[PDB]
């Protein structure tokens, strides 16, 4: 078997010719030869099987990466694994090979406008398919978008999305954590599990902001400082804001605040498209339930030249693991991936 790094890369005789690309969320993730289709591709190396919650994330990629078709989306091209249960210890996730991604391409090189708005009509197009099919990505940030030579945009890691659950998207202050933190809406910290639409239509705000101007907007330095950043540009929310908080701590928490003023987005971003930023700030308004939907966001006429709703495709069959074993989750991964032995 061939190795990468001092580290065990088993995927032959198919695959050929391995480089190391990085050290992902899940593991090693090197390029490799296909020498089937004659091109090469991307290979991720994931070794769940010591541990429940990796098990869970990795069932949860790899069950909805399956099922979604979109040009948006990363597909699985094929996996990897031993032929039994017994012998499998780590499974191989074959993808397209993509040049970069949104992080790494915003480290070093400035966006024109006309990318910027490419790049979000593609984000919102994808996330118009895994919206209708009733899944929550919950983790969009620019290292989850994958780019190729020539700015095909594909969203990856669906390994913390979840089915949407607005009726059940209500708690307590300061206890929840979903989302990385630069890219976590405000109700996260006040009242809000994260099971609701409008969480992915944030952090899309916060990636449209970041290509604007090459900076994360809203970096906090640590859980209790995001909100911090949020509040310092958008200033106090309004009374009618607060009082769709019903929950005493969190209301309480915004009304102990002195009086913080709006900055206006084209003061943060005196070059951008003013559609670009009447747009940004529909998908960064503070109240979720006034936030802009994924439809309503392809619409918008910054938009105008890509929009097109008969192109625009949705799920077939939306979907309508918490308490199971690390043995179980094994078994169903097992199984999940059944289809590509041979
Ligand atoms: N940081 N880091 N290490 C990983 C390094 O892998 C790269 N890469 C990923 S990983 C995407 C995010 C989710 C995950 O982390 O699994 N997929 C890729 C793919 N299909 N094609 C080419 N490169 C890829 C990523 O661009 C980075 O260069």
């Not at 809000?192 to 409008?198: A, F, L, M, P």
């Given at each position: 078997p061939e190795m990468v790094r001092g580290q065990v890369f088993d995927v032959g005789p198919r695959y050929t010719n391995l480089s190391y690309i990085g050290e992902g969320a899940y593991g090693m993730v090197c390029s490799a030869y296909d020498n089937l289709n004659k091109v090469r591709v991307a290979i991720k190396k994931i070794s769940p099987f010591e541990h429940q919650t990796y098990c869970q994330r990795t069932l949860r990629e790899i069950k909805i990466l399956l099922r979604f078709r979109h040009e948006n989306i990363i597909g699985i091209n094929d996996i990897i694994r031993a032929p039994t249960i017994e012998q499998m210890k780590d499974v191989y996730i074959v993808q397209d090979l993509m040049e970069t991604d949104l992080y790494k391409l915003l480290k070093t090189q400035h966006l024109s406008n006309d990318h910027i708005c490419y790049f979000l009509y593609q984000i919102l197009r994808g996330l118009k398919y895994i919206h209708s099919a009733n899944?929550?990505?919950r983790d969009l940030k620019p290292s989850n978008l994958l780019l190729n030579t020539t700015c095909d945009l594909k969203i990856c890691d669906f390994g913390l999305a979840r089915v949407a659950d607005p009726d059940h998207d209500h708690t307590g202050f300061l206890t929840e954590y979903v989302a990385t933190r630069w890219y976590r809406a405000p109700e996260i910290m006040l009242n809000?599990?994260?099971?609701?639409?409008?969480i992915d239509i944030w952090s899309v705000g916060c990636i449209l902001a970041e290509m604007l101007s090459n900076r994360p907007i809203f970096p906090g330095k640590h859980y209790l400082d995001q909100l911090n950043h949020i509040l310092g540009i958008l200033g106090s929310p309004s009374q009618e804001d607060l009082n769709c908080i019903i929950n005493l701590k969190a209301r309480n928490y915004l009304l102990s605040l002195p009086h913080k003023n709006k900055v206006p987005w084209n003061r943060l971003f005196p070059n951008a498209d003013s559609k670009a930023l009447d747009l940004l700030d529909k998908m960064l308004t503070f109240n979720p339930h006034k936030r802009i939907e994924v439809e309503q966001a392809l619409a918008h006429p910054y938009l105008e030249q890509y929009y097109d709703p008969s192109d625009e495709p949705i799920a077939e069959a939306p979907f309508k693991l918490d308490d199971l074993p690390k043995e179980k989750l094994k078994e169903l991964i097992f199984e999940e991936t059944a289809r590509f032995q041979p």
């Open positions: 899944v929550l990505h809000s599990k994260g099971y609701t639409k409008s």
